[PDB]
Amino acid sequence: NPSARIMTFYPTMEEFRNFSRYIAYIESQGAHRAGLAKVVPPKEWKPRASYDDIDDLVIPAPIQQLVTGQSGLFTQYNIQKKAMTVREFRKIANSDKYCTPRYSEFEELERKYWKNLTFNPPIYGADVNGTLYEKHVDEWNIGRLRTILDLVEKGVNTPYLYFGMWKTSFAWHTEDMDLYSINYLHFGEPKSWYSVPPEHGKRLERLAKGFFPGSAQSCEAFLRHKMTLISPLMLKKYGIPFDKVTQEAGEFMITFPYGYHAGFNHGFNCAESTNFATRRWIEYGKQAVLCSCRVKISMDVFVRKFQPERYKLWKAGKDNTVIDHTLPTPEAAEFLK
Numbered sequence: 001n002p003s004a005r006i007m008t009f010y011p012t013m014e015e016f017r018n019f020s021r022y023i024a025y026i027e028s029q030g031a032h033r034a035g036l037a038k039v040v041p042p043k044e045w046k047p048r049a050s051y052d053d054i055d056d057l058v059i060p061a062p063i064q065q066l067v068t069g070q071s072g073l074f075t076q077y078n079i080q081k082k083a084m085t086v087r088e089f090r091k092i093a094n095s096d097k098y099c100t101p102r103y104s105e106f107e108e109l110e111r112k113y114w115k116n117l118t119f120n121p122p123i124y125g126a127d128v129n130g131t132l133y134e135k136h137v138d139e140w141n142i143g144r145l146r147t148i149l150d151l152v153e154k155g156v157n158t159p160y161l162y163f164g165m166w167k168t169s170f171a172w173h174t175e176d177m178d179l180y181s182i183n184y185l186h187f188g189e190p191k192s193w194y195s196v197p198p199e200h201g202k203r204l205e206r207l208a209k210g211f212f213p214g215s216a217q218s219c220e221a222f223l224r225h226k227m228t229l230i231s232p233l234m235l236k237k238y239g240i241p242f243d244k245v246t247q248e249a250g251e252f253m254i255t256f257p258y259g260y261h262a263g264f265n266h267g268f269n270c271a272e273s274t275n276f277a278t279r280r281w282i283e284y285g286k287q288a289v290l291c292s293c294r295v296k297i298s299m300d301v302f303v304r305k306f307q308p309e310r311y312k313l314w315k316a317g318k319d320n321t322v323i324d325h326t327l328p329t330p331e332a333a334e335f336l337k
């Protein structure tokens with residue numbers, strides 16, 4: 001993948017059955033170079049039979065997202081609201097005040113998103129501790145991915161739900177500890193995404209530091225606050241390489257270590273997310289620039305199990321390793337030959 005473009009995968013039931021193995025395969029194809037990838041599950045596969053029974057589910061901390069800014073540069077302020085049900089949320093999402101505008105092409109809804117993001121602050125039913133997967137579903141269960149991340153246990157290994165409405169957005173960020181993430185769109189309107197290849201993440205970081213010097217002087221890793229919104233036109237103007245994709249109901253999105261992403265919701269929808277790891281991530285986690293002011297994992301456990309050679313060297317602070325973002329996960333051995 002020398003273009004480092006967002007790749008889409010259509011695994012067959014046999015390919016899909018093993019998660020970490022498929023993640024290894026996609027990586028062998030160079031999916032990780034984009035920072036983001038799309039996986040379409042086999043037609044037969046459904047994580048839940050019906051999403052009709054979830055009306056009385058509680059969103060405990062709804063956030064009214066207030067955006068301030070101009071000419072492609074913005075800051076999102078999350079005003080916590082009183083707990084509400086999925087029924088209360090769906091009624092607001094679909095109301096004449098908060099419903100999706102009329103549009104033809106996606107290019108139109110995007111244009112409208114970046115014009116109106118500062119007006120009529122929507123509510124986002126974000127970071128809801130729970131799962132919509134049924135107990136019995138073994139393939140790609142966000143609640144139990146059984147990645148090397150489980151070594152921490154031996155609360156970022158838990159799943160979170162997101163109830164979105166038109167114009168609700170997520171700011172530019174990599175995952176905490178520069179981890180991988182899985183995002184499944186359970187039902188509803190699409191979710192649009194923007195991605196910066198990990199090989200260019202430092203150019204986005206540099207750009208963001210230039211625009212928000214107050215923020216940068218206050219916290220080294222200020223993008224981790226998940227408050228910074230940057231227009232694709234601003235990225236294009238400052239020559240930051242990026243790509244866009246639209247995830248539709250019943251699709252999976254994978255974010256890779258140090259793969260900056262941001263996006264917005266088209267209308268009323270629900271998506272489940274969690275973090276996961278591969279052997280590749282261990283150097284990403286060790287090297288990660290964290291938020292000072294303000295999720296932190298002690299790498300020691302991983303460096304003792306997978307890098308025993310470099311353990312005494314790293315503990316000392318002599319492990320001068322340099323991350324190659326083009327390199328696939330060791331696990332992709334069986335798929336690279």
Ligand SMILES: [Cl-]
Nearest residue numbers: 107108111112
């Ligand atoms: Cl327009």
Ligand SMILES: [Zn+2]
Nearest residue numbers: 174175181255
């Ligand atoms: Zn994310």
Ligand SMILES: [Zn+2]
Nearest residue numbers: 219291292293
């Ligand atoms: Zn901070």
